[PDB]
Structure 1
Amino acid sequence: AQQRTMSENLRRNLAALEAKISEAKTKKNMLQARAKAAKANAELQQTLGGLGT
């Protein structure tokens, strides 16, 4: 019975791990694009502002 219990616990932990995996999969595709959009906005602001030369 306790063997079955440990098996159930490990199954649930596996499910949680896979859920976090899916989270990271969903975050990766768009965070990089947003990072690049931020750099483009920074370039635009640098070209617009008169800060420095």
Structure 2
Amino acid sequence: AQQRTMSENLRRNLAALEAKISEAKTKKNMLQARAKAAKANAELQQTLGGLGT
């Protein structure tokens, strides 16, 4: 009974951790995409902006 309830709680901590890591992976990737978008926008604003070489 001690081991079973201990293991169940430990299992729940494991699921919570994983869920958070899944969340972080989703967040990470959209930020990478957005970062590349920002960079791309900047390049067009440079080339197709004002005057200069």
Aligned alpha-carbon RMSD (Å): 2.4
Determine helix, strand or coil for the equivalent of 2:50.
coil
TM-score (norm 1): 0.66
User: Which residue in 2 is equivalent to 1:49?
Assistant: 49
Deviates more, 1:38-47 or 1:11-20: 38-47
Q: Which runs of 5+ in 2 are unaligned?
A: none
How many residue pairs end up in the alignment? 53
Alpha-carbon deviations, 1:31-53, whole Å to 9, x = none?
21110111122223334555998
Structure 2 CA distance for aligned equivalents of residues 52 and 10 of structure 1: 62
Q: Which runs of 5+ in 1 are unaligned?
A: none
TM-score (norm 2): 0.66
